[PDB]
Ligand binder design. Sequence first.
Ligand SMILES: CC(=O)N[C@@H]1[C@@H](O[C@@H]2O[C@H](CO)[C@H](O)[C@H](O)[C@H]2O)[C@@H](O)[C@@H](CO)O[C@H]1O
Ligand SMILES: [Ca+2]
Ligand code: NA
Ligand code: NA
Ligand code: NA
Ligand code: NA
Ligand code: NA
Length: 229
Amino acid sequence: ASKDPTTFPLGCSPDITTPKKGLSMELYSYDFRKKGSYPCWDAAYLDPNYPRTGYKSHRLLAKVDGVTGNINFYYHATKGCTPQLGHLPASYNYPKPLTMTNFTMLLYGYFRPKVTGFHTFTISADDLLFVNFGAGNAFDCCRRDSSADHFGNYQAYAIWGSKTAKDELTVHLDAGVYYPIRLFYNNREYDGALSFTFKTESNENTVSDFSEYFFSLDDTEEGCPGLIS
Ligand SMILES: CC(=O)N[C@@H]1[C@@H](O[C@@H]2O[C@H](CO)[C@H](O)[C@H](O)[C@H]2O)[C@@H](O)[C@@H](CO)O[C@H]1O
Ligand SMILES: [Ca+2]
Ligand code: NA
Ligand code: NA
Ligand code: NA
Ligand code: NA
Ligand code: NA
């Protein structure tokens, strides 16, 4: 698939193996600058290659499976320029404290729609959430191994304090097809927040609980390109 973001993204058709519930998550540290710097937070999170290669230089905290449910959070800090502990919601399947003021997080896997039609995803973040969506744009169907670092221009992005603090992505999707998805998050300092929800043209319900929507698929030899059309 093309890497470019599109309104009609390509999806994937898994084989016999049952998709596993939830997304994969990786957590990385994101240190402050040395005492007395102005500002105190590291600006690395906005380097253009930070979401591709830069984050990998940071200390790996965790890699977990099975992230699903409601993945939204709001972490309230009490002090600027200070690492403070907190916990992710239970949905993240990570039962240890981390520096919720300052960390990087990567989620990847597949989104399976329940209805065929236009979906509008709405995102917000403190500090940053970058979203790739579709085969190629995120990664290749059951070939994430060979394509994970080759994602394309973001389908949506949100940066706290910017002219784009919230964003939307509208895409036409087919029910029961599995669409590659990559979420890249950072908190630089202080409060952190992530909101990821959607609506469809089918009804006026907002979906915030991804239990029946987020899945993981094993990579395979020849891939699992979408077979529908
Ligand atoms: C703009 C700014 O620097 N605000 C300071 C606070 O830090 C920011 O807080 C926002 C949320 O309001 C966001 O989380 C951002 O990442 C942070 O940089 C904080 O340092 C506060 C300490 O009391 O001072 C504000 O001025
Ligand atoms: Ca913040
Ligand atoms: Na097979
Ligand atoms: Na740190
Ligand atoms: Na990694
Ligand atoms: Na909007
Ligand atoms: Na409702």
